[PDB]
Amino acid sequence: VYNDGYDDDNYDYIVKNGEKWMDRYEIDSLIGKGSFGQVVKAYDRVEQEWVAIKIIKNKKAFLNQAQIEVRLLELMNKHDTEMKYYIVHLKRHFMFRNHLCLVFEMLSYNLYDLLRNTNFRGVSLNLTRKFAQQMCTALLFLATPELSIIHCDLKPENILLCNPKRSAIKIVDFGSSCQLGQRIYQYIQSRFYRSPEVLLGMPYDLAIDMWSLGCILVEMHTGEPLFSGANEVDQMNKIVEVLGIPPAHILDQAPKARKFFEKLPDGTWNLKKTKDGKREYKPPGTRKLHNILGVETGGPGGRRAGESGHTVADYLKFKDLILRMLDYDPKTRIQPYYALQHSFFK
Numbered sequence: 001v002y003n004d005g006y007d008d009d010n011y012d013y014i015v016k017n018g019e020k021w022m023d024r025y026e027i028d029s030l031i032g033k034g035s036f037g038q039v040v041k042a043y044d045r046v047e048q049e050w051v052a053i054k055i056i057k058n059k060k061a062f063l064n065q066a067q068i069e070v071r072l073l074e075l076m077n078k079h080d081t082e083m084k085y086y087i088v089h090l091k092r093h094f095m096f097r098n099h100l101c102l103v104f105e106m107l108s109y110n111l112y113d114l115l116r117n118t119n120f121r122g123v124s125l126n127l128t129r130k131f132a133q134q135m136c137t138a139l140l141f142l143a144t145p146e147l148s149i150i151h152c153d154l155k156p157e158n159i160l161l162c163n164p165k166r167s168a169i170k171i172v173d174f175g176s177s178c179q180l181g182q183r184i185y186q187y188i189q190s191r192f193y194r195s196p197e198v199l200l201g202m203p204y205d206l207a208i209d210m211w212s213l214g215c216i217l218v219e220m221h222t223g224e225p226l227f228s229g230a231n232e233v234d235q236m237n238k239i240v241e242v243l244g245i246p247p248a249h250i251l252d253q254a255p256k257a258r259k260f261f262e263k264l265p266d267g268t269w270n271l272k273k274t275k276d277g278k279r280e281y282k283p284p285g286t287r288k289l290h291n292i293l294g295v296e297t298g299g300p301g302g303r304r305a306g307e308s309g310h311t312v313a314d315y316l317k318f319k320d321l322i323l324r325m326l327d328y329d330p331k332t333r334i335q336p337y338y339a340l341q342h343s344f345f346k
C-alpha cells in the first residue's frame with residue numbers, strides 16, 4: 001500500500017473529484033497525466049478563480065527535478081519585460097500529502113488538440129504565422145542572458161491557447177529545462193522534435209529549441225510531424241531524407257556519429273551500409289520541404305489551393321524560415337532576434 005493509501009503504484013496521487021485541500025482548493029477533475037505526475041482543474045476559494053494544479057509524483061528523482069522547474073518558473077515570472085507573458089504564470093506552490101503541487105493560471109487546450117480538431121488538415125498559414133511569431137518572441141525571452149533557459153521539450157502538447165477562441169499562446173512545462181552551462185544529458189527532447197546535436201550525443205545550447213520550433217511550425221500547417229522517427233536511427237534517417245547528410249565538421253566531433261553514419265577514406269561521411277536489397281529511405285536530401293509544403297501546388301496535399309493567405313510567395317518565405325531553423329549547425333541556426341526580422345513576418 002502506497003503513501004498511506006493516497007498514491008497508486010505509479011507514485012501518482014489518486015485524484016478524487018470534489019476533494020478539498022488545505023481549506024482552499026476544490027479539486028474538480030483530472031485534466032491529464034504525464035511523465036512527472038498529473039494536472040487537475042481546481043477552484044481557488046481564496047482568490048475566487050479557477051486554476052490548474054500540477055501534482056508532481058511522490059518520488060525523490062521527480063520531486064528534485066520539479067524543484068528546478070519551480071526555480072526557473074519563478075525566475076521567468078519575476079522578470080521585468082512584456083515578453084514574460086508568453087510563459088505560463090506559476091502563482092504558487094506547496095507540499096501536500098508528500099506531493100509538490102504547482103499552482104498555475106488556467107489556460108485553454110494545446111496545439112495538438114487544435115490540430116486534431118481540424119482532422120489533421122493543419123491550421124492556416126496565417127495562424128501558423130501568429131504562432132511562430134509568439135514562439136520566437138518567447139525564445140528571445142528565454143535567451144535573455146540572465147535567464148539563458150533551454151526548455152528542452154518543445155512540442156505541440158507544451159504550447160497552449162490562452163483562450164479557446166483566440167490565437168494567443170503560452171509555453172508550459174519547464175520540467176526538463178535547464179540553463180546554459182549545466183551537465184549535458186543525452187536523451188532529451190521528444191523524439192520527433194529532437195535536434196541532431198542531441199541525437200549525435202554532442203553538447204547543446206539554446207538552439208535546440210529553435211530546431212524543435214521549426215519542426216512544430218511545419219506540423220501545425222501540414223497536420224503531421226515532419227520527422228516521424230520510431231527510434232533514434234529512424235529519426236536521423238528521416239532528417240537526412242530532407243536535409244542531406246550532416247556536414248563533416250559536425251560528424252567529426254560527434255560521439256554518436258557511428259550509430260548512424262560511416263566515414264569514407266577521403267574524409268566524407270555516408271549513411272551506414274545496410275543489407276543489400278534493403279531500401280527504406282528516400283536518398284539523402286531528395287524529400288524536399290518545397291514539396292511537403294506544396295509551395296507551388298496549393299499547399300500541403302493541395303488542400304489550400306486558391307485560398308487567400310496562401311500564395312507562392314507566402315510559402316517561399318515560410319520555407320526559407322523553416323530551413324534556417326533546421327540548419328544542422330547550431331552556431332549558424334537562426335536565432336530568435338534574427339528570426340523575428342525575417343520577411344515571413346513583414
Ligand SMILES: COc1ncc2cc(C(=O)Nc3cc(C(=O)N[C@H](CCN)c4cccc(Cl)c4)ccc3Cl)c(=O)[nH]c2n1
Nearest residue numbers: 032033034036037038039052104105106107108109172173
Ligand atoms: C478547454 O479545455 C482544456 N483542456 C485542457 C486544458 C489543460 C490545461 C493545462 O494543462 N494547463 C497546464 C498544464 C501544464 C503542464 O505542465 N502540462 C504538462 C504537459 C507536458 N506534456 C503536463 C501535463 C500533465 C501532467 C504533467 Cl506532470 C505535465 C502547465 C501549466 C498549465 Cl496551466 C489548461 O490550463 N486548460 C485546459 N483547458
